[PDB]
Design a protein around this ligand. Sequence first.
Ligand SMILES: CCCCCCCCO[C@@H]1O[C@H](CO)[C@@H](O)[C@H](O)[C@H]1O
Length: 326
Amino acid sequence: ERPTFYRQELNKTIWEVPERYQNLSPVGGSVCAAFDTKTGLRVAVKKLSRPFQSIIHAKRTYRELRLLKHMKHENVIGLLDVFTPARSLEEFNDVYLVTHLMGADLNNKLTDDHVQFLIYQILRGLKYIHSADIIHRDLKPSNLAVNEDCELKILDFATRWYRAPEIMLNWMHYNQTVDIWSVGCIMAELLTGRTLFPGTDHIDQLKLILRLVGTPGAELLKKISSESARNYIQSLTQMPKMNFANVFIGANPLAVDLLEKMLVLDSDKRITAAQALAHAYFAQYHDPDDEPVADPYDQSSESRDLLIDEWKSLTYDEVISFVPPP
Ligand SMILES: CCCCCCCCO[C@@H]1O[C@H](CO)[C@@H](O)[C@H](O)[C@H]1O
């Protein structure tokens, strides 16, 4: 056991990886494309930079590695391998992560069947992520990778065009439907070929949002504990909710309807990922017996305040116990 490792120097640093990984080419922690000779796959190898430099780096390293090991779903980035050239904990300084080399992202105008398929897969991945009690919080085209056949994976990996309004108001307390807002913005752009809310700053962005969805109703105003937020919102010229048919001219009426259900100011009234999958817009793709869920991901490992060496040992344990996908 223990692969044989070989050394080389790429993009201003050294890389010790198993022989199975060949033809490393920087596309960049730093990243190289590689060919995995065992599986016949092209892969992304990430060498973490400075993984244990401080308590906070070490804790982040542990958290990222645990999260990637927990994610086991077709529409979510997964961990193909993790390794270290270290033979023991005492030698343990470097961590390398291996994932599917994804060809493109959604930043790289579509037919309706195609828009349907991409948003379907986003929602299928998001159902899974949300079922693990994880909120992504930064869904945007650059965090959505696609291959040849339009098969999509949500990436972990700034523009604020996809951000839910509550995040820009620094609400804290976020519901998982922050991500549904993002999906609505992404879907809108796939339909029209333009950014739905291209604000030049946070305030401009919120003016664009209000113009579409209209100013908060009394029902939402009842849920705002911030006195100054309330005072400001009341001072606004009441604007009505635009009719979405007139913004998304010619779009599939079912798409427009789903957009109306995602792009709601009140996060409590947004459709969930699981609900959205059953929307008639996705009739050709939806299968309730093939939209799997995750076990709850334990994030407590995260309110803890430990020593560097403790985070490092906990990370080492996670490297050693890794089992590659069968
Ligand atoms: C001027 C623009 C106002 C933005 C209004 C955002 C309302 C967001 O929705 C809210 O978000 C919270 C966090 O999940 C919840 O606690 C609330 O129940 C909900 O109303």
